Symmetry: D3
Subunit: 136 residues, 6 copies
Amino acid sequence: MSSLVRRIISTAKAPAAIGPYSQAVLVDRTIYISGQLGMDPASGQLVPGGVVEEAKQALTNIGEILKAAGCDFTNVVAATVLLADINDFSAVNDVYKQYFQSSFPARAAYQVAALPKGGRVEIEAIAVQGPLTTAS
Amino acid sequence: MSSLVRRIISTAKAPAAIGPYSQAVLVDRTIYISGQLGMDPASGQLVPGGVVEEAKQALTNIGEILKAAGCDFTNVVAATVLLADINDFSAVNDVYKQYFQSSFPARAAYQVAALPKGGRVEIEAIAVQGPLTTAS
Amino acid sequence: MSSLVRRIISTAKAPAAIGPYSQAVLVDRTIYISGQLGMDPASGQLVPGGVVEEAKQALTNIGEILKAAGCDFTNVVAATVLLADINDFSAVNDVYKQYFQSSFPARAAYQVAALPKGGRVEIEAIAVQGPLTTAS
Amino acid sequence: MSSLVRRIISTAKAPAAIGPYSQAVLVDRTIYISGQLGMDPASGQLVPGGVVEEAKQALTNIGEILKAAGCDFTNVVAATVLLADINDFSAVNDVYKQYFQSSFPARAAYQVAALPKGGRVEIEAIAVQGPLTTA
Amino acid sequence: MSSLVRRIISTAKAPAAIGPYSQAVLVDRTIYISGQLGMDPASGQLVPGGVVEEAKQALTNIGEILKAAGCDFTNVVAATVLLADINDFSAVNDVYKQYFQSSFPARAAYQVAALPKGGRVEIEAIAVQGPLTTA
Amino acid sequence: MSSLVRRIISTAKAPAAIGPYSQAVLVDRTIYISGQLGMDPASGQLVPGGVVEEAKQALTNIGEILKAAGCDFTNVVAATVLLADINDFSAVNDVYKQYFQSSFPARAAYQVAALPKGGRVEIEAIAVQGPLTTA
Ligand code: NA
Ligand code: NA
Ligand code: NA
Ligand code: NA
Ligand code: NA
Ligand code: NA
């Protein structure tokens, strides 16, 4: 059988993945991105200001991991939005909509019991390395 | 590198995906389907009657998104069943078993803190566009 | 279009998947593995001793499903660690790190409201059938 | 391993087989096209007029086989031009150029000792089913 | 990019190489088979009896190369029949038909000026490793 | 279906086209290389010295086309050696061996009636872009 490419993604522009995981793994053409919190890459802790500020930082973190893999937000095909409070969905969704223009990823959003670091939002994503011919 | 196909799936037979997400995204041969609640496509709200009725509607919604992608339930390879109450697993599983006959998807099922719309069940799925040669 | 391979994975060395799901599904080159609890394959119930003992059993279960698919832990590309208590993350992570040496999977870890069987940890994984050429 | 598509291409718009071969075989996305003489599709006989008329008919036949496989001449990636007479090279090149207007295929062209039915030219091709990317 | 499988196919059931070539090369799923003369595998000499016997032996040799690559004649998608004498066309066609019983490959068949060792026929082939889909 | 890469390979390090063909076509990962005569790349004329010198130049030209496509001779999977004179077989084999040092391609080699420009040898090839796996 063919030997498929696997690339470990690492960038200093996003919180370091310490311990036995990677920021993202590209395998064949699919990139599995680890869930990102609203963590500042240089502080090792949550940015202040609550769920809206954390959502902006989380998506900035995802964007920097995508860039390191040669992609941008147009390559995302599926995402999961995990919340500490379901009532924060609308506010987080108003941040999320700023990162996508069309051909939107599949998505699930729901409230979990707790996230690491006391986070109020965590975003996971799957992307596919381009080029991609988008039909509809 | 080759340009892989990406298709955005949209059908009126399932609740519309309003905002920055799609009902499903087909990319290469893999379809990522957004989590479906027991929402009536024409009412914009949960069907009445509780978790069993919602589970039937959620799976009907998934079925209509699959059809729009040229698939049926035999193309599903992985699913996630999210519950408002773990004790509803058996009742939801008795609905779920009606949609699959053999070569069953991988699955995870667990209780979350809250789903959108006050839902009691949400189902996510991954499918692969056929033809598929099923070995075992 | 080409007919892609789908294989249903079943091994007696891991808890049987009773009902309408499979331990894992291999489709093309990607293996979707059902979430595994710290369940003893021969008892049908959780191993005693708490979250650390359950985490060891869960990962042993994943390992036996991988073996049945012709893989080992080096083929895992993404994993999810679901917890009954976020404060158990460090203890579970000290077990998890024993199964991986390098080129670590993408990962998400968080606390859910409840797992089946009263479990304190559940691990889901995605693997890709080898050979894999790991770049970095 | 996956099961790859293999399809026999057959159209009555190209000449019937005069031996144990298919007009073309599509396998995965590559189409191997049998050598075409300048035979009229309805009668199976070589068209009159010599190498120029036979070359036009052979390429017309290839075109109908490509069309049956959902392709046109832009899908051809390689071709072989077998001549009964190397002095016909310039004449056949001028015919050939009119069918392959862009993304010219790779090619080999030379004289053999004899072609079936006394043909003056026979043309083989390899195509790849689209879509293909552009420069 | 992915690393594609490339394997040299070699079997003692087919004649040893008399030059700098492999019996066949498998790359991804396509198998390019070298031109086969009607040589006996054990001795490397052309079998007696002329074009009919040489054609049978050449096709038998192709069959053993296919078998070594996990294939049979149904995996062949394209072939080339090189003749020393175009008048042998009907005789070679009748031999060839007995090996290719279904899904007939694409083909080109014609006379060249000379084959190695004075062979009267040489046959090349391209195959695709299965599984392949059916009509 | 996916859009497969198709690229015309063209380098001034190999001779300019003297007809309606590209030096090579890359499609997906397979490279079809046009027949190369022993023509000098700068002048387009056959090198003096007969079949041995022409064979070296033809293979040098193939090498430059492979290099333009990010390949070398180890990527070649199949080749065809067309001779004006079958008695040159041993001489051409000795030249050919010096370029293909490992993983020898599949091959067909025989005499045709005439080559363009009065060439004594013409060589075609098929390559697959790497990476390829090893034994
Ligand atoms: Na959503
Ligand atoms: Na809070
Ligand atoms: Na389950
Ligand atoms: Na309720
Ligand atoms: Na993690
Ligand atoms: Na507990």
